[PDB]
Design a protein around this nucleic acid. Structure first.
Ligand SMILES: Nc1ncnc2c1ncn2[C@@H]1O[C@H](COP(=O)(O)OP(=O)(O)OP(=O)(O)O)[C@@H](O)[C@H]1O
Ligand SMILES: Nc1ncnc2c1ncn2[C@@H]1O[C@H](COP(=O)(O)OP(=O)(O)OP(=O)(O)O)[C@@H](O)[C@H]1O
Ligand code: NA
Ligand code: NA
Lengths: 220, 50, 552
RNA sequence: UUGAGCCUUGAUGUGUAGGAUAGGUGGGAGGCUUUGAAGUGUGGACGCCAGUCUGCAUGGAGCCGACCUUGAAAUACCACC
């Protein structure tokens, strides 16, 4: 219905300017929702080779505007450090099977460079959704003071898909377009720094910007 | 004539090789002997090559 | 434009004798192309496959694949570990992920340890955080639980020694495939598979792209999948676009024309020889140029290397009424029952074809008949006039370090078949092993030549209860028909185990059909009469395929 | 009249068991539904044959998310697809 009608508005053939895209997208403010941002970066890279996949984590400056519980698993008194800093959930090394036995709705990874008790089933119990943490992302360390603020900041990982197509939350429409552009630049520079060991052609083949219910526009 | 020329490449990695004639029909197994390698000045094992 | 996965340019090949099994084969391949390689036993198909996969670089010419393509090469007789089990043999295939999980759990152990926490991790784990992602080492468990279904692999606890012939090829196929490759080069991929597995594999092959070069002697298998046919007759590469039925007529036409040209050249040589042998007629020329032309005309051409003809089978002792009856036979391995309460009696002078799925006890029956095994119940009662001669299911019983003649005869200038002796050289020559081809070591032999030689060596006992276990292993059309016509004349009894019902359609007089639960049923007649029996007492059931697939 | 390429529009993706044809990440969330339902004939391609996509018949205001009993989840834009 309305999507077919606004297919006239969309101009998917023409790539669009960094700020002209946001100018087009903000006219879609008539949606009955928060209208979050759903950027899709489309790199040029072959995913089959292991060395040509990147999985990092960068801290977006202006934030996401949507928060989830942060769960920290500590072997000992590590699971209580966030209890005095605002951590959503603390798991004990003796409560590895009871860390999320009832509910698993805790999208916060586990960082504990000293307590390595609980990991979880080795078999997608804590490895399918990414519950297994490592210092490559940035959370692998025994200093939880930085991670306490990083969880509230929302350090977004670079989920490399089957062909190098990544999404994130980029400061939904209620954030000003200048903040949005700052986030775009800060993510583009970060991924350019993240470029793998082998690269050819142009790294960033395309970028699209859209809303959970709002159509897509090129970024160029 | 059924014997064809073969060369015994070295095994020390240097470029040095002897040459000989080997019956490739009745001796499909490859040759390897101990010969002198005047580059490294040692008796190393010489394996069969092209 | 674009495309062009693989190329070969003037790729010659010389063997120790002197001939060129391959000479001047220049051709290229394209993405999503299916090529079927034909020829005779000795044409060079397997050598071409080895060259194309890149095993051997002793060629003259060039053979290039495009970079970044994965090549899966299935050889003639894949070699596995007689110590391994199915679990630890398949687990080898996905190797970068088993070690990935092991090392990731070890790093989960070592990362909380405060010793070099920022040195032992950033350099080592980072090389694995993507080896566990691109290859997806997390979900190999469900990947295997799914991929086992399609092939219907043997049980995980099964050992390679306990494994049967068809299941071994099934395991090897899974191992080869799991790499998810682009180029798929197979040499006779359906040697031991039954109707279900062969139909499944030839549907999966047709679906799967990335170019498949398949060696096959089976018209029906080739027709479904092949888009191109390579001939590979006598050191030449003939590409044909079409199907088997259209290409066979062109092949026959080519042979007829070559024979006609041969006859014409012969007649020309006679005519010029007469002039060469004539007189001089005075003080005149006699034409040194004409002499040079005639001398040049004396060239040589290769007769088709093995247009093998009817084989040799020496009958032996006279046989009477008792043909080794069987009463109340029951077999099992632990709890796995193969056959229960089987009773029959083979008549005299008959051929009995055995049909059934893979690993259903067909080889076990010959094993217990030849005295290798024992029956858990009942008894097999041999006839006292019966001479036994059973062909092993596997070629891997010769010694590769011996010559053909030595291997067959035993280093005797005169051996004996049955009762009369006759020379060993003649005995081998009756199997189309000429004096020149006598000298090749049995390790240097094609699949069909190895099968022929093993059959020749074993059939010299001069028995009369021939227990053939898939003699149609690696046999061409003409090689197959030679034995197919020789068997119909056998005086003694012949029990034949095979999977290709078209071979049995011409020779079988009694039928042993295997079924579920360990049910073996006897029947008297050929396959058309078996179909008549089914239609007289029919049952509506045709829903065989389901196409399990491999990836989610 | 056509081969081939490119770009956009559509459609197709049925292992086992949760519910029953489900390709990957989503971004996260009930909104779609009313340019007129879940429902009532069947249009037709296909199917692994249970049916899910779809022309036209009156009215025209309906399904799931979430819970997950399985590795994974909810066709509810757009992305190189
Ligand atoms: N050392 C050797 N001396 C003589 N002939 C040899 C030697 N090595 C190989 N050959 C011959 O080279 C040929 C190789 O053929 P190849 O292995 O490709 O099998 P094929 O008969 O073409 O195919 P297939 O067995 O798969 O049906 C055979 O004729 C073999 O006898
Ligand atoms: N020693 C053994 N221990 C355990 N199982 C065995 C043993 N020998 C045979 N089997 C099993 O018995 C079954 C029948 O094996 P058999 O050798 O008769 O195969 P087959 O029916 O002739 O098959 P194929 O199509 O491979 O020729 C298989 O399931 C096999 O695993
Ligand atoms: Na071969
Ligand atoms: Na067998």
């Amino acid at each position: 219905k309305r999507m077919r009608v606004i297919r006239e508005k969309v101009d998917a053939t023409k790539q669009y300017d960094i700020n002209e895209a946001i100018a087009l997208l903000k006219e879609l403010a008539t949606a009955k929702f928060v209208e979050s941002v759903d950027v899709a970066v489309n790199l040029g890279i072959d995913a089959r080779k292991s060395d040509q996949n990147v999985r990092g984590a960068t801290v977006l400056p202006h934030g996401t505007g949507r928060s989830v519980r942060v769960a920290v698993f500590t072997q000992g008194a590590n699971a209580e450090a966030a209890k005095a800093a605002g951590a959503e959930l603390v798991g004990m090394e003796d409560l590895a099977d009871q860390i999320k036995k009832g509910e698993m709705n805790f999208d916060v990874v586990i960082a504990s460079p000293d307590a390595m008790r609980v990991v979880g089933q080795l078999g997608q119990v804590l490895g399918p959704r990414g519950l297994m943490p490592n210092p490559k992302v940035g959370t692998v360390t025994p200093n939880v003071a930085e991670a306490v603020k990083n969880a509230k900041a929302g350090q977004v990982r670079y989920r490399n898909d089957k062909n190098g197509i990544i999404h994130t939350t980029i400061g939904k429409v209620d954030f000003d377009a200048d903040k949005l552009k700052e986030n775009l630049e800060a993510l583009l520079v970060a991924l350019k720094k993240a470029k793998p060991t082998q690269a050819k052609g142009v790294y960033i083949k395309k970028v699209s910007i859209s809303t959970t219910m709002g159509a897509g526009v090129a970024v160029d | 004539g059924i014997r064809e020329k073969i060369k015994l490449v070295s095994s020390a990695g240097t470029g040095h090789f002897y040459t000989t004639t080997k019956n490739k029909r009745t001796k499909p197994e490859k040759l390897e002997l101990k010969k002198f390698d005047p580059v490294v000045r040692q008796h190393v094992i010489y394996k069969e090559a092209k | 434009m674009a495309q062009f996965v693989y190329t070969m340019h003037r790729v010659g090949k010389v063997v120790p004798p002197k001939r060129h099994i391959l000479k001047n084969i220049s051709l290229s391949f394209f993405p999503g192309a299916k090529i079927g390689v034909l020829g005779l036993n000795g044409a060079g198909k397997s050598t071409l496959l080895r060259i194309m996969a890149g095993i051997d670089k002793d060629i003259e010419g060039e053979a290039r694949p495009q970079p970044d393509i994965k090549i899966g090469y299935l050889p003639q007789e894949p070699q596995l570990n007689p110590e391994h089990t199915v679990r630890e043999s398949i687990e080898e295939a996905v190797s970068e992920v088993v070690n990935a999980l092991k090392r990731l759990d070890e790093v989960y152990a070592l990362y909380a340890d405060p010793d070099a926490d920022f040195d032992k991790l950033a350099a080592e784990q980072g090389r694995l955080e993507e080896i566990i992602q691109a290859h997806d080492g997390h979900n190999l468990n469900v990947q295997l639980e799914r991929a086992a279904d399609a092939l219907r692999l043997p049980d995980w606890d099964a050992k390679i020694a306990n494994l049967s012939g068809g299941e071994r090829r099934r395991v090897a196929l899974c191992r080869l495939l799991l790499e998810k490759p682009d180029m798929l080069l197979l040499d006779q991929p359906t040697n031991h598979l039954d109707a279900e597995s062969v139909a499944w594999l030839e549907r999966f092959l047709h679906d799967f792209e990335g170019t498949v070069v398949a060696i096959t002697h089976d018209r029906y298998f080739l027709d479904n999948v092949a888009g191109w046919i390579l001939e590979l007759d006598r050191g030449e590469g003939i590409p044909w676009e079409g199907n088997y039925s259209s290409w066979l007529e062109q092949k026959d036409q080519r042979l007829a024309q070559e024979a006609s040209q041969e006859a014409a050249r012969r007649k020309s040589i006679e005519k010029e020889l007469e002039w060469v042998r004539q007189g001089t007629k005075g003080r005149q020329s006699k034409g040194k140029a004409r002499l040079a032309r005639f001398e040049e005309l004396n060239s040589t051409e290769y007769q088709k290397r093995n247009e093998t003809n009817e084989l040799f089978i020496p009958p032996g002792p006279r046989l009477g009424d008792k043909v080794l009856e069987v009463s109340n036979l029951r077999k099992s391995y632990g709890d796995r029952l193969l056959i229960d309460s089987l009773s029959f009696s083979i008549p005299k002078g008959a051929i009995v074809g055995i049909i059934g799925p893979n690993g259903a006890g067909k080889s076990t029956l010959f094993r217990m008949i030849s005295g290798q095994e024992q029956p858990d119940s009942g008894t097999i009662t041999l006839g006292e006039t019966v001479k036994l001669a059973s062909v092993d299911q596997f070629r891997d019983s010769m010694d590769n370090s011996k010559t053909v003649w030595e291997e067959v005869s035993g280093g005797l200038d005169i051996m004996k078949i049955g009762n009369t002796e006759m020379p060993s050289r003649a005995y081998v020559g009756r199997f189309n092993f000429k004096g020149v081809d006598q000298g090749k070591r049995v390790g240097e032999l094609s699949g069909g030549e190895r099968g022929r030689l093993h059959l020749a060596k074993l059939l010299q006992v001069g028995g009369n209860m021939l227990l053939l276990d898939q003699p149609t292993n690696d046999l061409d059309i003409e090689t197959l028909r030679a034995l197919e016509n020789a068997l119909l004349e056998f005086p003694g009894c012949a029990m034949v185990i095979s999977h290709d019902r078209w071979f049995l359609d011409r020779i079988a007089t009694h039928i042993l059909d295997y079924q579920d639960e360990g049910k073996v049923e006897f029947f008297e007649g050929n396959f058309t009469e078996y179909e008549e029996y089914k239609k007289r007492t029919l049952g509506a059931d045709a829903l065989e395929p389901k196409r399990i697939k491999y990836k989610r």
